[PDB]
């Protein structure tokens, strides 16, 4: 199964995020290419609960969290399903890479198809900040771009 | 279950399409408000197979047709699942209305969540044209706007 989300916004940030999962038990491979970010920085990269784009990136809701856990790093055992951590941007402000994740799925009851992907304006503190907000959003700041994860071939 | 698709494009046409289905066996209620169309006209309104927006509205593919039937009117027994027919536009070029459909579903194997909705530039001939194209696209023309159907609450 394949899916793709085209990140758009009014802040100069844009990109494409591709997802791939052969079967439900398998990890999903997330590939991304995002431009227009601050150069040489880490930026919060998360999957939101809804794919509602009626009010910009705001209507996408909070991080996809079906198991009701606190915000964390992708490698943390306690993290939201949509917690993809930070993506690094180069001297030209482009973030490009890929990784596999075993909580994010394109198949089954927790499928992220129809939900949104958000690239943040700030860095994700990975749930390590001494704040309640750290456990909710990782304090990653505004959402300059987002896109609904749609089906593809 | 609720879903929404925000129709956008570079041709002045835009809008919102809302979907609602309580349970799989139930019809889905499609509500729409679309502006920027030709005034006092009928325009093809369809659901495409993919929600891939990487190449404008083109990457969405053909009409969602899991049962491999020919193009038809929504009331036809032989139609594509994504065949929503034409929507009427008023003297100001706005198409606004709602209807229920029993082939379009937000739940189950034929769910349209993650797929795209397209508003056409031309009228749908409802599969009655004396052309092979009539049985494929209804000859509805270009796709000025489209949006990926995402989950909402
Ligand atoms: Cu976030
Ligand atoms: Cu069409
Ligand atoms: Zn989170
Ligand atoms: Zn059709």
From Swiss-Prot, chains A, B:
Description of how the protein assembles with itself and partners: Homodimer in holo form. In apo form, heterodimer with CCS1. Zinc-binding at 'His-16' of CCS1 and Glu-42 of apo-SOD1 is required for this heterodimerization.
Disulfide bonds: 57-146
Residues modified to Phosphoserine: 25, 38, 98, 116
Enzyme Commission (EC) number: 1.15.1.1
Gene that produces this protein: SOD1
Descriptive protein name: Superoxide dismutase [Cu-Zn]
Residues the record lists as Phosphothreonine modifications: 131, 137
Known outcome of mutating residue 142 to A/S: Enables copper chaperone-independent activation
GO CC terms: cytosol; mitochondrial intermembrane space; mitochondrion; nucleus; superoxide dismutase complex
Highest taxon of source: Eukaryota
Crosslinked residue numbers (Glycyl lysine isopeptide (Lys-Gly) (interchain with G-Cter in SUMO)): 18, 69
Job description of the protein: Destroys radicals which are normally produced within the cells and which are toxic to biological systems.
Residues the entry annotates as binding Zn(2+) 2: 42
Binding site for Cu cation: 46, 48, 63, 120
């Amino acid at each position: 199964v394949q899916a793709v989300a085209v990140l758009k916004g009014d802040a100069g940030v844009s990109g494409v995020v591709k997802f791939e999962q052969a079967s439900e038990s398998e990890p999903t491979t997330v590939s991304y290419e995002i431009a227009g970010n601050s150069p040489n920085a880490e930026r919060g990269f998360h999957i939101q609960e809804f794919g509602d784009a009626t009010n910009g990136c705001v209507s996408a809701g909070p991080h996809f969290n079906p198991f009701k856990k606190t915000h964390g790093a992708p490698t943390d055992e306690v993290r939201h399903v949509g917690d993809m951590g930070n993506v690094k941007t180069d001297e030209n402000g482009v973030a490009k890479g890929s990784f596999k994740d075993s909580l994010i799925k394109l198949i089954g009851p927790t499928s992220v198809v129809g939900r949104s992907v958000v690239i943040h304006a700030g860095q994700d503190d990975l749930g390590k900040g001494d704040t309640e907000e750290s456990l909710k959003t990782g304090n990653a700041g505004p959402r300059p771009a987002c896109g609904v994860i749609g089906l593809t071939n």
